[PDB]
Each structure stands twice: as structure tokens, then as C-alpha cells.
């Protein structure tokens, strides 16, 4: 939908990422593997949990109807009573539906940016050092092991440590050597 990610360029979610809502998958000399981003799932849960309790709180003053008894020749205020309570019970039933319909749209879109903002986070760290492969995934120039994955995972990668390594690879898969 709105933000571009879920059901977007990242075609399909993974069943293998069991521990959390968004996360990482890597592939290197040592292993392959999935790893949920807890930090940012835990932040998304905070926000959904708050949404759920938001509603609950908002409908404790909602219209309570205790009944009234009515006569044979009071028929037309008996009705007035019935028109009212049926009235309010329609107005609050509408409200409770529409709010859900509205919050559900907002919630599914909340995940949609959650994912994308993660990706763009990874992207802004790894710059020239990696290829944007265009399907949710990056391949590095410099070859990056497990300890170095973590840094990307926990957002403290170091560009100017693998620079040469990487830009020796850029330098060459640019066919620039091929003139000597």
C-alpha cells in the first residue's frame, strides 16, 4: 500500500524469521541466517499495545441504557424512549466500527513504513561500500563477516574501515584496470 515495502519491493515475508516482526537475513563465508530486529519490533508493539488500550480507555463513558417501564396509553413516549436508545446504540455501533476500520488501515501502513525505514537505515550506513540489489537486499563490496554484520544489524557499521577494501572492488568491476 502506501509506504512501498510490505507486499512491495520486498516481495513476501519470511516464515523463517520466527522471533519478531521485522529483521535481517545475511549470507557470508561463515554462515547464512535470519535474525529479527527486536529493538524496532518492540517499538512497534509499544505502539500497537498503546493503540489497543487507547480505545479501551475511550469507551468507558460510552452510553449505558438502564430500562424504563411504560403504560398502555403512554404508547407514544414509550416509543420516544425506544427511538432514543435504538438511536444511541446505532451511533456508538457506527463509531466502534468506523474507528476499527480506520485504525486498521493506519496500523497496516505503520508496519509498511516500519520495514522501509529499517531498510533506509541500513542503506544510509553502508553507502558506496555496498550494492543496492533492488529487492530488499545488499551485497557488499568488501567481504563482511559475522561481527561486522552485527554492526549493520545494530546500526554502528563503520564506512571508513572497509573503504579501500570496497573501493578496490569498485575500482575494478568498473573495468578501469583494463588499460594496462
Amino acid at each position: 500500500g502506501l509506504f512501498g515495502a510490505i507486499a512491495g519491493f520486498i516481495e513476501g515475508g519470511w516464515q523463517g524469521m520466527v522471533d519478531g516482526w521485522y529483521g535481517y537475513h545475511h549470507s557470508n563465508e561463515q554462515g547464512s541466517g535470519y535474525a529479527a530486529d527486536k529493538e524496532s519490533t518492540q517499538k512497534a508493539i509499544d505502539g500497537v499495545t498503546n493503540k489497543v488500550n487507547s480505545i479501551i480507555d475511550k469507551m468507558n463513558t460510552q452510553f449505558e441504557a438502564v430500562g424504563r417501564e411504560f403504560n398502555n396509553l403512554e404508547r407514544r413516549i414509550e416509543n420516544l424512549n425506544k427511538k432514543m436508545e435504538d438511536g444511541f446504540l446505532d451511533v456508538w455501533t457506527y463509531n466502534a466500527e468506523l474507528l476499527v476500520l480506520m485504525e486498521n488501515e493506519r496500523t497496516l501502513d505503520f508496519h509498511d513504513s516500519n520495514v522501509k525505514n529499517l531498510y533506509d537505515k541500513v542503506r544510509l550506513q553502508l553507502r558506496d561500500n555496498a550494492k543496492e540489489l533492488g529487492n530488499g537486499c545488499f551485497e557488499f563490496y568488501h567481504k563482511c563477516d559475522n561481527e561486522c554484520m552485527e554492526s549493520v544489524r545494530n546500526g554502528t557499521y563503520d564506512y571508513p574501515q572497509y573503504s579501500e577494501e570496497a573501493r578496490l572492488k569498485r575500482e575494478e568491476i568498473s573495468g578501469v584496470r583494463s588499460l594496462v
Binding site: V66, R68, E69, F70, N71, E74
Partner: protein, 48 residues
């Protein structure tokens, strides 16, 4: 059981909604209706 009508019944039931406990008390002792007769005040429509 005896046929009749309870005047302003529903308005009573309204008050009755807002009550939690009654304490029945005696105000006009049946015994003390000396001139007239109370004991002879029954009906087949309200049997026991």
C-alpha cells in the same frame, strides 16, 4: 389476583429501581379496627 388496577404503577417501579432494601413496619394494627370488621374480607379470586 382479585381484578383491579394499580394506579401510577410504572412510576412506582421507577422509584423501586433506586431502592436496595425495605423494612416492612406496622402502621395501622388490624386488631384495632374496633367498630368495623376486617376478618371478613376475603375472596375466592385470591385463595390460599
Amino acid at each position: 389476583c382479585y381484578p383491579g388496577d394499580f394506579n401510577d404503577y410504572e412510576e412506582l417501579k421507577h422509584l423501586l429501581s433506586r431502592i436496595n432494601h425495605f423494612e416492612k413496619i406496622q402502621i395501622i394494627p388490624k386488631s384495632s379496627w374496633s367498630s368495623h370488621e376486617a376478618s371478613l374480607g376475603v375472596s375466592s379470586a385470591c385463595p390460599y
